[PDB]
Amino acid sequence: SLKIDAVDLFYLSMPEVTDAADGSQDALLVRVAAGGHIGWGECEAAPLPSIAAFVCPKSHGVCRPVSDSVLGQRLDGPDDIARIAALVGYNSMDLLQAPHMLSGIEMALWDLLGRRLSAPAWALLGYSASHGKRPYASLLFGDTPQETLERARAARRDGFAAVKFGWGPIGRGTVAADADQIMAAREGLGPDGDLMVDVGQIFGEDVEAAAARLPTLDAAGVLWLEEPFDAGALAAHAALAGRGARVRIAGGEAAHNFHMAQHLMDYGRIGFIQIDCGRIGGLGPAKRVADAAQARGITYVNHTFTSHLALSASLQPFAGLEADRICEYPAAPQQLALDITGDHIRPDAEGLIRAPEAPGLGLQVAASALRRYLVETEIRIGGQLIYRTPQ
Template sequence: MVLDTGKNYSDPSQAAEAHGVRFISLLKISTDAGITGWSDIETQPHVGKSIVDAPSGGQIGFESLRAALLGEDPLERERLWQKMYRYLAYYGRQGAGMQMISGADIALWDIAGKALGQPICKLLGACYRDRVKAYASTLFRPTPDAMKAAVAEYLKHGFRAIKFGWGVFGRDLDLDIALVRAAREEAGPDIDLMVDGGWYGIAYADPFRPRPLRDWIRLVKALEELNVFWLEDFLHPDNYAGYAAVSEHTTTLRLAAGEQLAGYEAFERLAIEGRVDTLQPDLSRCGGITVGKQIADLVARRQINCVPHAWLTDLLKAASLHLNAYLMDSLYLEYNVSSASLLNHLCEESIPMVDGTVPVPTGPGLGVTVNERIVEQYRVL
């Protein structure tokens, strides 16, 4: 189903909080036992709906998500993941196809937790923590003064970590450094600061945002002087060699990436070939919680980190908290601070932040309940 949030993405020249996505994609799976599972999916939802409802193409590989799941036992999550992957094989191994598989996988984990009366982290096999440090995930403001004002506001709300991304960042090296320096001056030395470079532009007039590797290497040195914790997603997602080249010039600064990748193999390449320190699977894009668990096991073996990308509603926030609970070493939960109230109030129970941390839900499944009255109010498809 598709929900309309009513606004487009913010103008990067304005000192404004991001509104959020224009449309939300929600997936609901119902069982004959009366148990339902939910997921939100960060994809173009009109495309996603067509993947759910597509008519049969006449053979395996050209089928719909609905055809893959109807009549199946929802507790056989691994078999159903493999079945969905094969039913959508010719068009779904990456992109929107994999994203809808991811959403279905999350919903199946939600169903399993509800059926067994356990939170998802228990089904994963480990709950190392009951709270996760949150970072405010927001846009770069266009001036140093606006950056300082934004930092002051997040500190007032209790955040101890802030990530600025996209917006005006990535076109003017001197301005980039000035904006980050202003944030550090306002935050002081004890607040974690992260930077999300963004690998493409957000202005329709110029969607490219190119920057040579040598300029990123120059920026890395400045970010280390400003004690930035990580630089995120600043190259094309498949440029593993580029990430490795920049990594050679880091000492304290971590490189983070992966929100637009799918499948375990891509994350293994990012860790080994790209030498990325922090993998960032979006559970609604990478293959769901099933693949997220594989990535969590990978980072444990390689002694690097995993911080799920989670910039959507409390459904994705809850799923990411369960993966954070399973991680042997957890750094952060990405906390969506966008102004779109629908993103933050889709569920009956909000997931609160207290003293800079967010609790892992303890209820069965995801541990949050979708407010279906809101769904019907904003539903367009």
């Protein structure tokens, strides 16, 4: 038997963290050890609250620290991962942060087992192949169409054949202003590229306002319209999706369990589900969504925006879904995110990347990142250390 005998949590940060909407400025890295075998993962989460979730004194039987369900658990194959995740689901049910902390640990378990068994995580997850995905750069709409045009042109020059434009002025004013923006993105990208549009919930619950953009989206060959409405506005999503446009509705990036994804799929009638492994509980729950998406003719996309460790994890749950051909890619992250791995995922001759055809998550975490970016962190309860920065 192998048993988990250490979980080390590394709070990493860039020296200055700004108010930019940039989640690559810090990270919580997780190193799991079981009988000398090592696995790494990354939480898509506030690092200190997640650490607190891992080590806190229990409040009661269903508000236990995450560590209670992890340390000392048998880890021999995939089925143990499911058991550990279910245990955290029950015993930490009232610890709100738990899913985010779980996510980094859980992916580390797949990494650990893959490297112990010389199998890629995607193979352990049940896929027989890892197929090429076209990476998309997540871009901001310019304040003017002219700026969007140039941004799209610059992305294409940089080698992207797929881009998503989001936020900025989009949906904040007239249908005509949105038409200029979306056409500018298409014009700059070129006619053969994949173009997606994220409106960051700007239409609220106003189905007619969102629907007024569908002809423009279809004219520009836009594949998906992400987050047209408030996250809770499921009926609005379904109504918009029922309008018959070619562009499909996308959502899911903030789901922190399978149910939230399923709500969007079944009650929201979305056509692209977008899943962050660093949020949803890791690879197992993401793979659950991918299976459910397949059943429904819904396309799975990853959501990821930090390191290549997180990117590798993000690709595992749809590695074997050949037709789900687009993936999110961290096109311009902070140096921390680049530095976290020694090696990186590289495109093939067709510009496609894939969940590494290599053991576990298929990437080496760089000890040198650990040192440079390490945040000195300690928590004491009753005078006694319950968490200190590891090495």
